[PDB]
Symmetry: D2
Subunit: 459 residues, 4 copies
Amino acid sequence: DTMKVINDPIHGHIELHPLLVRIIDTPQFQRLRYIKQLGGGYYVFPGASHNRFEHSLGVGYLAGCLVHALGEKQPELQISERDVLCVQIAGLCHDLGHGPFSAMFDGRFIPLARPEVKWTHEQGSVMMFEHLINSNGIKPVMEQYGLIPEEDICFIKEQIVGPLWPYKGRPENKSFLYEIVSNKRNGIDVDKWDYFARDCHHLGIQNNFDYKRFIKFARVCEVDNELRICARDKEVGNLYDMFHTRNSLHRRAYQHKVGNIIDTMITDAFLKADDYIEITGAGGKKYRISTAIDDMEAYTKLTDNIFLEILYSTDPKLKDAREILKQIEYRNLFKYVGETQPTGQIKIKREDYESLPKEVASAKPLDVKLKAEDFIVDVINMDYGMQEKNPIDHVSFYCKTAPNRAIRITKNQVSQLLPEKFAEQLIRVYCKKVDRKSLYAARQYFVQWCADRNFTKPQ
Amino acid sequence: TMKVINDPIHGHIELHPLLVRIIDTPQFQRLRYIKQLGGGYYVFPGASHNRFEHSLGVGYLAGCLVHALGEKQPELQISERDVLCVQIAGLCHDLGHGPFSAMFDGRFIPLARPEVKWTHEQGSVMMFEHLINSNGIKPVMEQYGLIPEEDICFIKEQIVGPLLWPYKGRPENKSFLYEIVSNKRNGIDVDKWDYFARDCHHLGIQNNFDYKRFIKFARVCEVDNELRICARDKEVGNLYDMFHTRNSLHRRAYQHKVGNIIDTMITDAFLKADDYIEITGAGGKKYRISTAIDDMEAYTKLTDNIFLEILYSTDPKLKDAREILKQIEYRNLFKYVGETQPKIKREDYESLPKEVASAKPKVKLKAEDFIVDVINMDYGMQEKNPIDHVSFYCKTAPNRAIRITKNQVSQLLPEKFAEQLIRVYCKKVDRKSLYAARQYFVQWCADRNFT
Amino acid sequence: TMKVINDPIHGHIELHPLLVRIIDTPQFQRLRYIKQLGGGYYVFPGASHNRFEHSLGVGYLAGCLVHALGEKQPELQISERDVLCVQIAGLCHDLGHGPFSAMFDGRFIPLARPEVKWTHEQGSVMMFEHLINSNGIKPVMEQYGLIPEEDICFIKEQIVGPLWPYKGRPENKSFLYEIVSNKRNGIDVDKWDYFARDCHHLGIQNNFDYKRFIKFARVCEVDNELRICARDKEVGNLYDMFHTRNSLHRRAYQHKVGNIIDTMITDAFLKADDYIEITGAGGKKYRISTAIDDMEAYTKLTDNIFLEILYSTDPKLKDAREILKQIEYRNLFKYVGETQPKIKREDYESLPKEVASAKPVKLKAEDFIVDVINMDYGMQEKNPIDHVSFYCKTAPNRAIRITKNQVSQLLPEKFAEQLIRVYCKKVDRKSLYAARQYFVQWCADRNFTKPQ
Amino acid sequence: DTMKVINDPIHGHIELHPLLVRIIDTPQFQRLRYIKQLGGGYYVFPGASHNRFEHSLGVGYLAGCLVHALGEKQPELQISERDVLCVQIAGLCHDLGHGPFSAMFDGRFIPLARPEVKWTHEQGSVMMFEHLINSNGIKPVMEQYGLIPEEDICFIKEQIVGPLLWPYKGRPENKSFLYEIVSNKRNGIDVDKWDYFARDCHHLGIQNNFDYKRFIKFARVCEVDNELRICARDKEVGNLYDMFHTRNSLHRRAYQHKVGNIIDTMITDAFLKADDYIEITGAGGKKYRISTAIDDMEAYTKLTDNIFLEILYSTDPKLKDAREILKQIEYRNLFKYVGETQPKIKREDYESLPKEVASAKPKVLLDVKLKAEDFIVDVINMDYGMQEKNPIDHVSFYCKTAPNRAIRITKNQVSQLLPEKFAEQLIRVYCKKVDRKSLYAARQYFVQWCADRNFTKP
Ligand SMILES: Nc1nc(=O)c2ncn([C@H]3C[C@H](O)[C@@H](CO[P@@](=O)(S)OP(=O)(O)OP(=O)(O)O)O3)c2[nH]1
Ligand SMILES: Nc1nc(=O)c2ncn([C@H]3C[C@H](O)[C@@H](CO[P@@](=O)(S)OP(=O)(O)OP(=O)(O)O)O3)c2[nH]1
Ligand SMILES: Nc1nc(=O)c2ncn([C@H]3C[C@H](O)[C@@H](CO[P@@](=O)(S)OP(=O)(O)OP(=O)(O)O)O3)c2[nH]1
Ligand SMILES: Nc1nc(=O)c2ncn([C@H]3C[C@H](O)[C@@H](CO[P@@](=O)(S)OP(=O)(O)OP(=O)(O)O)O3)c2[nH]1
Ligand SMILES: Nc1nc(=O)c2ncn([C@H]3C[C@H](O)[C@@H](CO[P@@](=O)(S)OP(=O)(O)OP(=O)(O)O)O3)c2[nH]1
Ligand SMILES: Nc1nc(=O)c2ncn([C@H]3C[C@H](O)[C@@H](CO[P@@](=O)(S)OP(=O)(O)OP(=O)(O)O)O3)c2[nH]1
Ligand SMILES: Nc1nc(=O)c2ncn([C@H]3C[C@H](O)[C@@H](CO[P@@](=O)(S)OP(=O)(O)OP(=O)(O)O)O3)c2[nH]1
Ligand SMILES: [Fe+3]
Ligand SMILES: [Fe+3]
Ligand SMILES: [Fe+3]
Ligand SMILES: [Fe+3]
Ligand SMILES: [Mg+2]
Ligand SMILES: [Mg+2]
Ligand SMILES: [Mg+2]
Ligand SMILES: [Mg+2]
Ligand SMILES: [Mg+2]
Ligand SMILES: [Mg+2]
Ligand SMILES: [Mg+2]
């Protein structure tokens, strides 16, 4: 068993250790070839055909670069081949839990199909990782290459989903290893760096963030009795620009008005198909689209394929679901009516989403009257990854003249031209009735609703 | 109105409303579910791109080249109608591709149905006919000034060639319109230009060919009482490099040893699934993977999805097909045994595993255990130099077409323009079987005086 | 005929024969010998690009935008003549740059000649006049359908603004004045070329899609004037354009060391100024600081002046040559600190004296550099986007305004700030320590932010 | 003294050890900022403003990557920090000898100005490296960071120019491979090529087909003829034929562009007319000419592309002839291409060719008769870097199944679509008299000359 090399358009030649190859060459990992990174984004940006598989390889590769680089610069950290392998495995496996159309699945479908459960694709990744290990005899292969499976499986999981020192996989003196793949402190992790580059390459938008530079300048210093990753103070401006780029990719691509409408329609189709579709899990037991998340053998076979299974079906019980997807192909989509924003420092909460179409329909501003069933109200939260908080206040820096002393850099020390808030909310309204007289009316309800709630007058 | 689409290769592509109506059909949107490079994606993870994107790009580039000839030479009398027809042909030229693209017409259909002669291009014509007829496109064409009887014929002829001037869609004085999307004279067409750029972008290999430059320098001149596209004489070196790039993309990516083995395995899985899978066509009639090419309503639903349908199946009659695809996920692939060089004709492909298995070198193995992959590497015209079939003009006389021979360009160019490679693989992957398979292979090579 | 030029930023650029005649003059070819980013090249080794390349690119982009407005809206009655004039203005808009570009009009001339008010744009107009008059271009213009009196005025007005305030073109072609140098809001093709080109060469990636902006640009009536309007959808991308510009200033153009190198070159030029002779019209001799008064002399004033000084043996140039030798050895002046308030151009000269008078080795005003850096959105305290007109899909001739609250609550609350950096010319341990003490006391004395 | 980081558009963040910084921050190195990589190419391809300085940093960086990567993959090679520093210094300094407008200077000007001497920019690089060391107190700085200057200076020089039975003194046979990184004498596959392909492409606006990063990942060291050499993975053989293809392709389109070469010829003409009147101050205040400054590195230090502008901006009447030639470049009244043809003609015969053309007696046309001074005859050699030889026959490969056994791969084992020849020669003729009647005549002399020497009808 040797090294394999994989050519990636974002990263070039990626070297994979034989243990990583064994993990990649499983049904649980190869599944990611059949789930698009950007979901309904592909129906607006035709370049965005990229799947989670490619992304996952890239996060494994970048997880490895950052840990290797900290190791070469600071030998006193005593970063081991074992540490490197575990960090790479976590990068490779961090997105195993994604479902059909990625963000659509955990952002839209599961909260509507199963309001009782709290599910994240990250929880899924842990469960799918457990299934992958156990059903492909990976524990002995790990031992062969010097890993200790009890400690290291825990470590890999904790890197994906998170956990007085709360972690068991590695002690405080390797705390920094937990900032690479998924950074809970501030969000600055290699996962972001891969998706910015990859999404850009494919969308046809250009990426402003130099991850290779950030890596060269990263050191480990002591902060609050913990060894953490610190950035060179000089790079502070570039980190505010990293979040700016992320928010900019959300505005243009990920929350595109039509991409979101297509995700909403697919979600609608899935909800109508949910009672009739059967996915075979462990012991031949049958699961639904919404329950396959409870059985990883079933979940393994739940991919973007589900879209085509519904579209190509002839069963009359799937007629409603299939008609929604047929309307996507013909491009008879629901129609955008307008966008607006809360002026209040209080955002609209998930509890209130269901009641919004009713509120719009009750606006008393007309030819055609319209009903709550005719409106979609899409509520979009845009932030810097920590609700109302500035992520950069949670970043540690060093200076050239004292590279072991960690410091904080406040927002006033960087620039007066930076954002005064780090979270905002956008509300888009669409209409399901698409003729001239209905759209005109829908727009009237929308503007009056905006006046009724002291929201921003629309464009 | 117009719609704008952002593409990573071409930037902002403007689509006329008629083109939008054609794109927004099930027959076109189907191309979202067929990978450009098929099994290449299982070697080059960037190659997730599908035929849909490519098809938009050929529509766009077909439009650039025809617009540019029109602006430079108004005397050609290129009409908005001509432009729309050329764009529609670029959009629709790849409608006939099946699951995993080249795999489908290169490997599967010739094995599943040896009696028929099928190309994805014939498929594109049939799928175009189905698309028109089932989406009420003829009246939309008339609305924007096309004449459907003439123009549908013209669009088809652009895709597949004619159906002693052989064409009906357009007369001799617009002959050049037939060289844009699919060039039968020499292969220099916008379809190549899109795939070089797109495949490169995604594979992670860099493209040496500047199509935008070629377009700026393209003119139409009279050659043998026919108006054809000519290249600026200065560009001759760049055209030899275009074919060099194509052949280079075949060596590294398209005929990758493992990419081809994965295509062979998928093909194997399809042959074992063929008798048991049902695809619903017109009037509810059922078709097989290999027969869906006879019914375009069925064919519409035959995409890369078929791979997952087989993989996720529980039916025992699909166990054999499903096990082959499961071995792809585990990466227990068929194993490369060796490569060699003579040409061997398509007529002989089926009989080659038998020939290998009959080698008696100084575990025995059977013909079912060997794959013999015959790979033709050329400049798109068998043994011929495509550039001998290119017309050029000079700066000082831009209407006089000329030929440029190979000795006038460089003594460092290829002496031949076609060669053939034969690879052998084994389906039995253990130590003792591979060793044997290698012995059969070398003795076979000695038996046929190959390298 | 036409010539084609391959550019790494724009691909194949087509040049009409009249534009070739303008390019093939000493006054234009001069721009091959002036670096776009000046002292930036001594920090970012990719930034070897010169103003010539940039100038071709602005000519090309000026042409794309005007051609595209013409194809989309024939009712504008944009003529081949209008197109040629806009292209010529793009080609010639940067003719006035001096040695090391921004250094020359930002730093050297205000110090060498405080009495005069000079911009490279005024220079471009004068150099354009010289180019025309000394290369017999007026009859060549007439040959290809221009009307030189009207059109020369038009080209100049495109570069520098008015000299309805315009004479070269009436109100119904107002929009032609927004292409090369946009006085209303700063959104012009000149920005677009430098973002792309600077990025390509610096090794930083450009976030702004100029080709997209062009596809979406229309002309609509605003206040009885036909202006360029952007598609409403693009408002977010325009805030990001200014964000990108400001980002290129933070990282590259105002790099601490790039600015120190510009300051050192400026210092060398000030010491060489009285001893250099550049031959102008009538054989009259000009200095580096006076060559801006005579375009024949100015023609021969390029980055070459740096090497002339560096390679000299003349004792009168010893002081200037020693400063430039210290740049090669990399014995640069040393950064002491940064701070923030605004300080006006009138006050720049007096600042080293103010620092040296701070009472916290003693040090003197000649020992300090005080570099005042203005970071804004190109209109001082103003939001440029409040001065942009937009159209909607549903009514593409109705122009509208879009306020900042309609776009995003995550946008800047301010559009201008000022940074002050201090450096010391005396580089030993004891001097730097002292220099830092003067600096912090000065900051306390003027109620500036205690330094990082 | 620490590390410095430099951002390069081709290579990204380049790390430079303090010793390398000391070498870079000298007048002898910084000089390369004032010499364009592609010379007269910039007057055809406006993107090609790049100078030798940037290139030189890039070769230092790539020299370092390749040696570091061989070291990480094969610890048994015993590659030292010292070996790495020496290879990097050689990459940084390999182009120190270039003169004004790069190839123009050693290809055209010096062979015409000083036919007696044999000069290459590489000899210059060695001499300039010696001057750089000696005049900037670098020997002690080298010792500070663990180099041994007598051995290591020799090693660095030998890497640049070749040796000065195992011919090398700087390093023994077991580190032979270190000599293949910067300038490969065996086959030409070196990091110097890799930097210029990428950089030239980036700037010219032509796209690069060669993946140097891939080549590096696949490079190993194996034993060949009792010597440890760099070997390529057998699978990469096709990509190496494509590397030479790309080089030859960059020569056809950019480096030997008809007008780029004419501009180099005009600059050379201007330099020859200025050579007697320009004075460059060298060591001890002794004065050198443009053509003699190559004999004194203190003078040579101040000889850059600046010399072009010094001549252009001059007012001295003795420089009027030289200055008028350069003024004609700005106005674009260039010398005019008359024609091209193909046979080889040897360097010994270049000088005599304009005379041969002018002696052609064409069947009695001729308004204007023309003289040898009126013709330029440009002889252009297009090859794979080894005259008539296939460089790939001089490459060693390994297989996956035996990565320590080196092998050869013949051309028939790779492809029947590869070149049958690896060298050809082009002859271009130009005329200095540019009016309609002169060009027509010049073309008549040219075709008769071609008939007289049995060359291809043009
Ligand atoms: N950029 C690039 N150029 C190429 O020429 C090329 N060829 C392949 N690849 C990509 C495809 C893959 O992403 C990666 C590995 O390809 P490889 O062909 S070295 O590997 P194995 O077939 O496994 O050969 P073995 O088993 O004998 O070592 O490089 C390439 N990528
Ligand atoms: N029509 C279409 N087909 C595709 O296959 C496709 N792929 C990407 N895009 C891009 C191009 C489109 O601009 C974008 C959104 O689709 P749209 O325009 S239909 O939907 P709204 O804007 O809500 O409706 P309208 O303009 O009719 O009022 O997606 C596409 N658009
Ligand atoms: N490069 C780029 N930057 C962007 O900011 C951007 N925004 C969208 N796209 C891509 C996505 C598509 O491929 C294309 C069109 O997206 P569009 O937002 S203009 O259009 P419709 O939604 O149809 O809006 P309407 O109906 O009001 O005209 O550009 C973009 N592409
Ligand atoms: N991208 C690119 N590829 C190339 O192969 C190439 N060759 C040249 N150029 C660049 C160099 C220039 O920037 C431009 C045109 O050079 P050109 O060789 S078409 O033309 P003239 O010398 O003018 O030949 P004539 O007088 O017969 O037209 O393209 C090229 N640019
Ligand atoms: N090195 C350097 N220091 C500086 O302080 C500086 N300031 C500008 N530049 C460089 C960066 C660019 O390459 C160029 C910008 O100047 P141009 O004359 S093409 O246009 P404007 O109308 O001045 O710019 P805008 O409208 O955005 O204010 O000069 C600078 N470069
Ligand atoms: N790509 C990129 N992004 C940037 O934001 C950027 N900023 C600078 N550079 C380039 C400029 C140089 O090529 C390189 C390092 O510049 P640096 O600003 S880290 O370094 P010193 O000023 O020497 O500061 P110290 O001594 O305090 O570490 O990166 C940059 N390159
Ligand atoms: N303008 C121009 N004309 C030319 O004839 C020419 N020839 C080379 N160059 C440019 C092209 C490159 O930028 C560089 C090549 O010369 P270098 O000193 S970096 O290395 P070598 O060892 O000579 O190259 P190799 O080993 O491949 O034969 O000079 C040229 N540039
Ligand atoms: Fe991820
Ligand atoms: Fe195609
Ligand atoms: Fe400018
Ligand atoms: Fe070199
Ligand atoms: Mg995730
Ligand atoms: Mg995250
Ligand atoms: Mg096809
Ligand atoms: Mg074809
Ligand atoms: Mg300017
Ligand atoms: Mg401006
Ligand atoms: Mg060299």
